[PDB]
Design an enzyme around this catalytic site. Structure first.
Site, short mmCIF file in Angstrom:
data_model
loop_
_atom_site.label_atom_id
_atom_site.label_comp_id
_atom_site.label_asym_id
_atom_site.label_seq_id
_atom_site.Cartn_x
_atom_site.Cartn_y
_atom_site.Cartn_z
N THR A 164 -6.53 -1.31 9.59
CA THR A 164 -6.20 -0.21 10.52
C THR A 164 -6.20 -0.65 11.99
OG1 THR A 164 -7.04 1.29 8.86
CG2 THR A 164 -6.58 2.20 11.05
N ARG A 180 0.87 -1.20 0.00
CA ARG A 180 0.00 0.00 0.00
C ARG A 180 0.89 1.24 0.00
NH1 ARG A 180 -2.07 2.71 4.66
NH2 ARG A 180 -3.82 4.12 4.17
N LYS A 198 -13.11 2.49 0.10
CA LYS A 198 -12.89 2.52 1.56
C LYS A 198 -14.18 2.98 2.20
CE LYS A 198 -9.03 4.07 3.08
NZ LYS A 198 -7.85 4.92 3.26
N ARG A 253 -7.44 18.38 8.27
CA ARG A 253 -6.32 18.42 9.24
C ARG A 253 -6.37 19.74 10.00
NH1 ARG A 253 -1.46 15.94 5.80
NH2 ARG A 253 -2.35 13.88 5.33
O1 LIG Z 1 -8.00 5.24 5.92
C1 LIG Z 1 -7.84 4.28 6.65
O2 LIG Z 1 -7.16 3.23 6.38
C2 LIG Z 1 -8.62 4.33 7.95
O3 LIG Z 1 -9.23 5.40 8.20
O4 LIG Z 1 -8.64 3.30 8.62
#
Ligand SMILES: O=C([O-])C(=O)[O-]
Ligand SMILES: O=C([O-])C(=O)[O-]
Ligand SMILES: O=C([O-])C(=O)[O-]
Ligand SMILES: O=C([O-])C(=O)[O-]
Ligand SMILES: O=C([O-])C(=O)[O-]
Ligand SMILES: O=C([O-])C(=O)[O-]
Ligand SMILES: O=C([O-])C(=O)[O-]
Ligand SMILES: [K+]
Ligand SMILES: [Mg+2]
Ligand SMILES: [Mg+2]
Lengths: 501, 501, 501, 500
Positions: free
Chosen positions: A306, A54, A248, A95
């Protein structure tokens, strides 16, 4: 024993050597990247069971990304093993800004009244926190009183109690003791800030990655099919139709629109970092299990991502909770498990890939008994689906060491993988795009070969390649599955049970 | 739509034309057999759905049987369709004697006390009934007080109250009002009269049939595995090892030894005529259902026989109860249903076959829902078994028009048939003995083809034969199963799912 | 050992003694009915296991019907057991008329050209067949060319080739060799002859039966819910609203509208006589199985009827096919089996009931293993449903001798029955109307008692009444079910498992 | 919305106020116990969903343990809710000794050669580590060359390369960089140190706890049925037969003899601390899932324990992995989840209970779909089993708000609990030992009542109590189960489905 659960490892400086120095050493950054030394470290991760790297375009410019992709291509040659190339978009990140006076951070107490600015291109002060909004969008009209602004992995909560038209500022109350530092992630859950379907910066980042050569794109903060379709159009426009898109799922919109997103995408990355801030903390496991079930039912790839082994960023061993987390992602039915900071900027990147591999391997042993996926429930809408179901049944009834498929496009391999047979899946294909493109399907071992000339040729190729690879030995039973001829499994398919000579 | 349940039709004079005369006409038996005109009538039975003809050696002479078998081979060329040849043995009989005065019969009333003589070669009187026992066996010592002597299809009961050793006579009580006529069938249930395992009569009949070329032998009054093994020995001695043996279950000892008899035999014929006399009349359905279940579990052939459409011997339409009986034999899981006097001796042989075929086709449509048999209980222990299970699942999941098996021995056709797939089974075999041997297996359509040449594509040949025979057309989906390569002595190892060109 | 499947026995002259003569003896009809001798015969049918008597209004005047029911009322006192009273309506029957010159019948041959007259009140000749139509309806406009007129159980087919407006006659072609005798049933399938939803004759017959006291009505040729509704209205208006209606399905329209007929009715009578003429003969078994499944699913009563033991009209023993037909109706899940001609008009009425009882009791022993009904599919709506399902499980899980329910309306007995528990169901109830109303429900033994005073009372009554009936003794486990208080199970109901002390 | 999964919280100084000083204050140990203020803090834990308090006899003396139990007795009164009292035994613990010259710890590098002494009652040096072995056993003959000595939650490994017969010391190689501090946990996996079935120290602690009044004993390091039976002997001899025994499974012998241990015990505590050091770390999930399945199959109580919300010891929020860990223990079929350091000595004991309660509540909502346990498999061999199976089906078929059982022994509550009905279970009992003894069974809300006057009475009581406690209101469907004739200790043989 082959690891059936695929690992995505994020790359960064943690594996990179600069002038004989390792990450964190005095004057590391004053030195040029040592490409060969770095490539040899990345090769160890491949050997330990990383199936795809990644490249996180949230951090680092194009030259840094392009250099890291070149280093992985050298690592593949060193390892004598190929891996997938996955680009992860920055997407619509908020951010905290830099502070005035170069202050790094301030501490806040429960009950303090401060402000959040919406003006872009400005510095924070202790009492007025400014935001770096993706594409310098003005969010003032997009956030209602009663919403929560969360700073730094959701650790500090700011409740919006009023809005100030004069300054376009959110008047907020500090909900809990905490720190606001510069350049930290911000979340505003349950809002519909009108970020474009594809921002210019992500468009540019994707086009650069496509130029370098990639297999996968994980699109950050997907809310609708449109977020997937605008990326698909660039892949198609540039002659990169081979690229698979993982949406995602990181917020409530993505969960709400999950069915249309799965339909448009090639798979889902369960982004538990943003998801664990954007929804209630105790719902994350519900959404994890529900998403894995629906992506598997669609014959698509799910990545569980994550904080899976987070403590291993700093310490040489995971916690008992982290072991349970990785193990249960496998039992849930995940195709792949992911490392982020653990491999990209931790002290123990190889040890993190090794620990993940060990857990994933231990867990696959319990899938027959404890697996939450239910292939018996699937409707068989095609002959390749009824053949995949048959392959599953033959692996449950006979002790089948290996399933071998000859596949032009990967289609037979994907459908066999969907059914989660109690066997490894050797997928023989005839081009490197299809080969790398199968590296995140559960159980699939892709291998490049020459296209066969006849059918009888095809069963011999299948047994010889399995033998040459050390997957099977004389007296082992295998199941061979192909279209007749190869690539035509939609019109005519075949399954043979062969004893290896 | 093809009939999956097989029909066994008994041949006799009812279809036979003698010098232009029909059975029952004046001077019929005076004329010679019209072989072409008789073959034309038999071909109409084949077209109406007869799959095997029964030659009942209880009646006729060997010349009549051999002639009839030759008339059938001519009928097969007229219909363009082959059938199986089944010999049914006479077995042991007990018959009431002639009376003195040549009285035809006497009427009796309940409670009357009379005698039954065991001495052979004497005549009956009203007061003392004489028996013709097969082999002139003296049965005195084999029937205890408390046994029942039944006369004329078990319509008249005599209870054994006492035994007179002076005359070797049974003192019996008439249990119900009835007739004792001359040369009527006698049954003495729950006795073990030492009829030989193989009588000279059955030796002669079996060996004659074997010389003519039969495929099946139905063995009357099978009591133990020895009764089957003695016939198996003749088949082995004579190089007729391919001949299949069906044990006729007709009495309590056969029911008690059912498991050992199934293991010894290739199948069971449920002989409901004698069974209905030898066991309580209301228990026959219990034993019918139990035998069909056990024989299906064993992978063997079951024939439901006797009085299925008995009123059609004299009437152009069956009763409601007869329609129900045939229909429920199919639902019970029978491979085959049988006609005896309805096809052999009656006024409506063609109409009897047509009615049975109509009932059998209507009932097969209900087998998916109401089917008694459960294929899910079978253990997939072999390559051929798991492949046969795969076929069943393909046919349960898709609309499969036809299952084609390339089978040297018929083993693969028998294993697919056991699973009762929702499809016709075309069994392509390479010799006439294997082809005719498959004619009673549920759903199997045997077809003869040239042994595969080195350069032949078995799969293309299979499809082409199915298309030419009109079983499938362009766009139908079929399943093809074979032992690759060249249908050697290699176990079935290959399944194709094919959309027909 | 209690017979769970209920018997309807049709009554008629077969059981009636006149001047000491039995039906069919010379001068029988010249004598008056012997009520004491006839009642003794009917009492024997009760001991044998008749649960309900059918009075068929197709044949006999009100005086004959009234004397018969009065005989039945006397029968119960000889038997010391009560039985149900069912009235079956003439409905819209067509019959052949008397012939001129007192001729009884004519025989016809295929191809013959004859005529069918529509004018009412006239007599037939050989060349012109006249019809007796219910309510003297003109049918000339209501049957088209190409339609079929069938005579005598559908044995003889007449094809309508033309309609002669001048004479209002059908020109018909004889379809097959057969006989047209006087006063035989005529059927004209797939037509819509406008018979009133209720005819004055059927109106009148129903009102008579209600005055005598009937528990059930079966309604002939029910085509829609309309035909049930009109009979319901009379039953209420007379204070007889307790009367259960069974719709007779006898024709295509009844089958086409079965769902709405089941909603309106309390139950269905499968009238296989007319059904076998009005639809394809070989399809009756499909409709029988289908109707029994749907009526069980609605929690209502299904009666399998007509020609179940037909040969026992003339002979003392049934055929193998008849035994199979009765046995398989029980396996299908029928609540009741029925005798018509066999008990009404036959030489062996008591033997017919005894035979049907023996077969029914033998078949119930196989319901566990072979029962075609599937209680697991039913959606448990009310708490009464879930209590019923729980009672089923308790009888599956343990050796339960008996289920006792205390029921005001019988509604708990009806839902427990629906689930076909492996136990007899003693229904204790508090009037004679409810107690006879339950006599056609599977497994239910009705019993009259006075209402309970307390809950501890209600449970002690269930056990005492059970020991007193001889249904259970000390050491036997029973399940008691009830509303609390008794008759309100709809809101609050109780299940107890108790060992008899 | 009631929490069906039970929570065991370990008690310690974290909730206890000394003078006015909270834990970790300057001279905290420099005061007496503020008993009322401590009991009010413990009451907040009861309110947040702690169902049982664990008193860990590894740490403290009888006086400290005694006062803490007494503070709990006060908190119940303040909360208006009773809780279970569980004693957890020290057991055969090995610890590192105090150091020569009062040194706190030393740090070591991979490959360093050092010694471990077996001699008892001596101080450690950097070069020669001494052990405080339970019972002062000499372990020299019980550890072969190539065995592994692990220090501080298994973080530092020592490989026995040789044995010195002259000093009875292990020659070990440091396997990895790490620290040896004083008074840290030591594990020697895959050894059979002849610790007694019941050591005198554990005998004494159990007898003291029995004296104060407890409901449960968690027996540390159970290897065989003998370890449980010898504790059962004492509960029996002292007239404490009501006490339920949880075997703690935390080493390979425990796993190997699991079947005979489940047979002997009332339940299992999955002690993942020691277990993850004694077996391959990445295999703990296998043993957790197997153990939960076997203990539900036996209709006994299983507690999932140790490091479930570890980070909440020092931080206000758990990790994603910790949320996943607690959630999946519920999905696995656990009766109860436990807190140790999080409630006993961390900064956020109340927030720890609250977080576990929230995850546990959310997870129980997914048991109908994703639940590991399968109840269709249980033998229905008894009237009670048939009735419990009938209750489960009622809750599957209908929206049932509550199952009420009137139970003298709690047996009917336990059987119903085994089936994991989709409903809360109110268990009406008539003594306080039965009441507290049911507090770790899945879904069971125990409640004290007077034995009923009649059948009508018993059914009437059941509904009224349920309505009083606010469990159900008018229009709610409940299932009531009892043994009639009522009160005669009759086996449950009556079910009623009742609209309130
Ligand atoms: O973007 C990512 O991988 C997350 O927020 O877990
Ligand atoms: O997998 C493939 O290439 C196919 O569809 O044959
Ligand atoms: O021999 C037979 O077929 C019989 O008796 O049914
Ligand atoms: O059918 C066959 O010949 C086989 O596969 O053995
Ligand atoms: O009316 C009847 O009962 C019949 O047709 O079966
Ligand atoms: O059975 C009854 O009448 C009731 O309780 O509904
Ligand atoms: O003792 C404990 O609870 C452990 O070791 O986990
Ligand atoms: K009628
Ligand atoms: Mg016979
Ligand atoms: Mg421990």
């Amino acid at each position: 024993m082959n690891k059936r659960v695929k690992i995505v490892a994020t790359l960064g400086p943690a594996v990179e050597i600069r002038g004989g120095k390792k990450f964190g050493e005095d004057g590391y950054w004053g030195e040029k990247l040592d490409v060969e030394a770095s490539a040899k470290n990345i090769a160890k991760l491949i050997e330990a069971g990383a199936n795809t790297f990644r490249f996180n375009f949230s951090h680092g410019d194009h030259q840094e990304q392009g250099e890291r992709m070149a280093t992985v291509k050298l690592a593949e040659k060193i390892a004598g093993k190929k891996v997938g190339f996955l680009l992860d978009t920055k997407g619509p990140e908020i951010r905290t800004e830099l502070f005035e006076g170069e202050a790094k951070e301030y501490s806040y107490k429960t009950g303090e009244k401060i402000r959040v600015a919406t003006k872009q291109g400005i510095k924070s002060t202790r009492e007025v926190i400014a935001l770096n909004v993706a594409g310098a969008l003005d969010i003032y009209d997009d956030v209602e009183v009663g919403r929560q602004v969360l700073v730094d992995d959701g650790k500090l909560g700011l409740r919006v109690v009023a809005k100030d038209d004069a300054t376009r500022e959110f008047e907020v109350e500090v909900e809990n003791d905490g720190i606001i530092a510069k350049q930290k992630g911000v979340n505003i859950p349950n809002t519909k800030i009108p970020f474009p379907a594809l921002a210019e910066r992500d468009n540019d980042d994707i086009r650069f990655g496509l130029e370098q050569g990639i297999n996968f794109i994980a699109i950050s903060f997907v809310r609708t099919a449109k977020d997937v379709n605008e990326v698909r159009a660039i892949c198609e426009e540039t002659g990169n139709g081979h690229v698979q898109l993982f949406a995602k799922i990181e917020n409530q919109q993505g969960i709400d629109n999950l069915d249309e997103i799965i339909e448009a995408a090639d798979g889902i990355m369960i982004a538990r970092g943003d998801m664990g801030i954007e929804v209630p903390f105790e719902m994350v496991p519900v959404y994890q299990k529900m998403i894995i079930k629906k992506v598997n039912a669609a014959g698509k790839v799910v990545i569980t991502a994550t904080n899976m082994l987070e403590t291993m960023t700093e310490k040489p061993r995971a916690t008992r909770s982290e072991v349970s987390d990785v193990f249960n992602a496998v039992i849930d039915g995940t195709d792949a498990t992911m490392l982020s900071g653990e491999s990209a900027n931790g002290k123990y990147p190889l040890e993190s890939v090794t620990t993940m591999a060990t857990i994933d391997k231990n867990a696959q042993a319990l899938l027959n008994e404890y697996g939450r996926l239910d292939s018996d429930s699937f409707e068989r809408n095609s002959k390749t689906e009824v053949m995949a179901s048959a392959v599953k049944d033959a692996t449950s009834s006979m002790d089948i060491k290996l399933v071998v498929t000859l596949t032009k496009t990967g289609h037979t391999a994907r459908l066999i993988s969907k059914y989660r047979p109690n066997a490894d899946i050797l997928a023989l294909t005839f081009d490197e795009l299809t080969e790398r493109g199968l590296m995140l399907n559960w159980g699939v071992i892709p291998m490049l070969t020459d296209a066969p000339s006849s059918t009888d040729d095809m069963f011999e190729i299948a047994e010889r390649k399995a033998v040459e690879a050390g997957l099977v030995e004389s007296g082992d039973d295998i199941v061979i599955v192909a279209g007749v001829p190869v690539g035509e499994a939609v019109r005519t398919n075949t399954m043979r049970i062969r004893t290896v000579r």
